[PDB]
Amino acid sequence: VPDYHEDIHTYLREMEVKCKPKVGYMKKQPDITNSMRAILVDWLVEVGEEYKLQNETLHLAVNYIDRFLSSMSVLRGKLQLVGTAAMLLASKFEEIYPPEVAEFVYITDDTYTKKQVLRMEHLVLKVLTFDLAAPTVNQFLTQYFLHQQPANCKVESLAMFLGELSLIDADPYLKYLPSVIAGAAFHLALYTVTGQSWPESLIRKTGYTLESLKPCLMDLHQTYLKAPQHAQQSIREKYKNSKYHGVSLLNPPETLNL
Amino acid sequence: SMENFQKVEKIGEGTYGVVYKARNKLTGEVVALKKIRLDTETEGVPSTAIREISLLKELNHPNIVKLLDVIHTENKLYLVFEFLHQDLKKFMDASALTGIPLPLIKSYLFQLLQGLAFCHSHRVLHRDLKPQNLLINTEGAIKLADFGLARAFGVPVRTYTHEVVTLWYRAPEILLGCKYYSTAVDIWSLGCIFAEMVTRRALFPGDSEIDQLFRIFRTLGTPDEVVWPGVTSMPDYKPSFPKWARQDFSKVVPPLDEDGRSLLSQMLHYDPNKRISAKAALAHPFFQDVTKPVPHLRL
Ligand SMILES: *CCS(=O)(=O)c1ccc(Nc2nc(OCC3CCCCC3)c3nc[nH]c3n2)cc1
């Protein structure tokens, strides 16, 4: 739709700042931690696989969760309820055939009842004031992919893989905007696979240089190198599939050029 | 919550919910209230409401119907909208004997294209443009309404819901089962509506998907690989389709001048890639003398 491409990019750059969670929020949660959140997001990855949901749905759900927990204190017993309602809302927003509510009750192992899921759904809507059309890492990556020469589907799947790993760890990735994580992920995928770098044409589009992406890149490179040891593994399993060209099997680079 | 609103009468039922006319007792404002039942869904808040509200909060524009407020209950959600006076369908019937003046057609098309360009710039497809969803006021404005079939798109798009757009206003790429569609589907709808304001009858009033295709093909020619690269590999294309010759556009909408015909033809281009954007259409010479007349309203 090349004609609205730049208007849309501009608009998403504006809205990503408005949908941004609060970077410090876990410090203010008395009862939950980054490690509990990692467990939850990893579980949502599995749920996404189980029901064959879009990656976008997963990214949206995690945005909803981070924004909700930015203002609402939640006990550990209830963190999965928040996450289940967020995935339900994301599915309703984004999916052609979302799973029905009963399916969402079933995958929580009847920890929660259906009316609890529906009531959380409504509370999450109130808290986010219905502002659900949030920009994601995935939406930026997809635009950035159009600047390949030519398209390389391993580069594409590996970028999505790295962007997805960023969802698991609130420290450090909550401090980076989606467009920046997408930038770091695209560059790191492109260099890992082809040896090439963040292209000139994307500097013109985004205003980001390798310099400006460096802090995120340094974090993301470390996450990639340590992905095999991480307590959470569902994203590595998912990306062994041929649908993603088995990219979780590719060797991360020992070092980057800079 | 609803303490301050006084219901006046029911307007109708769109894609979901029911719409009433109401007035704010404290300010005097006349509003349209869309009532949405939640206890009917122990599936919860419907996807159509979730989309309509999240998108309409972002889309603030003089040719897009304005969402003023959202009022919750446990059991009901009420959307408060600015009230408009009638739909374009009603207005066209009211105009049957006397015709819609060209200045007003031009004004309405210009305004609709502004509204649509705004939607498309904000990554929103409407997917249900038709005269019943286009609302006018006593001051010469027209606005896009009923965003219950709308969605947020990505660049580049993926496969979205197939069962989309009312049949008469549905683009050929959807009828032929294309894997991808985009903003061009809304322009197609608008092109059908432009022709309809001029003649006062629907351009392609088909009774089925195949009847719709055949009506389109009789007016614009059966598309081939020259006019639309890739048509013949599209999923619901049949090589048995009759091959009709294209009609010259001065017969399609006989009252339309040269500039009008040029514009209509770029809006009804088969190839979605070549179909004119709303943004580009605003600069077409058809609009060089555009004004904003006030219609003759018989509320
Ligand atoms: C047939 C009734 S009318 O033409 O006299 C008429 C139409 C519209 C309004 N005002 C109005 N209506 C709606 O939504 C009504 C639905 C729209 C979709 C099709 C079914 C009806 C509005 N939404 C937001 N503002 C609105 N204003 C008055 C009279």
Author numbering:
A (entry chain B): 175 to 432
B (entry chain A): 0 to 298
Please give sentences taken from the publication describing this entry.
Cyclin-dependent kinases (CDKs) play significant roles in regulation of the eukaryotic cell cycle and in transcription. During G1 phase, CDK2 bound to cyclin E mediates phosphorylation of the retinoblastoma tumor suppressor protein (Rb), which results in activation of members of the E2F family of transcription factors, thereby assisting entry into S phase. Following degradation of cyclin E during late G1, CDK2 pairs with cyclin A to phosphorylate and inactivate E2F, resulting in S-phase progression.
Guided by the structure of the CDK2/cyclin A/NU6102 complex (Davies et al., 2002), the nucleophilic residues that are suitably positioned to react with the vinyl sulfone of NU6300 are Asp86, Lys88, and Lys89. As has been previously observed within this inhibitor series, the purine ring makes a triplet of conserved hydrogen bonds with the backbone amide and carbonyl groups of Glu81 and the backbone carbonyl of Leu83 within the CDK2 hinge. As a result, the vinyl moiety can react with the side-chain ε-amino group of Lys89. In this region, the electron density map has continuous density between the side-chain amino group of Lys89 and the inhibitor’s vinyl sulfone, indicating the formation of a covalent bond between them. The structure of the CDK2/cyclin A/NU6300 complex reveals the inhibitor binding mode within the ATP binding site and confirms that the vinyl sulfone forms a covalent bond to the ε-amino group of Lys89. These results prove that Lys89 is the preferred site of modification by NU6300.
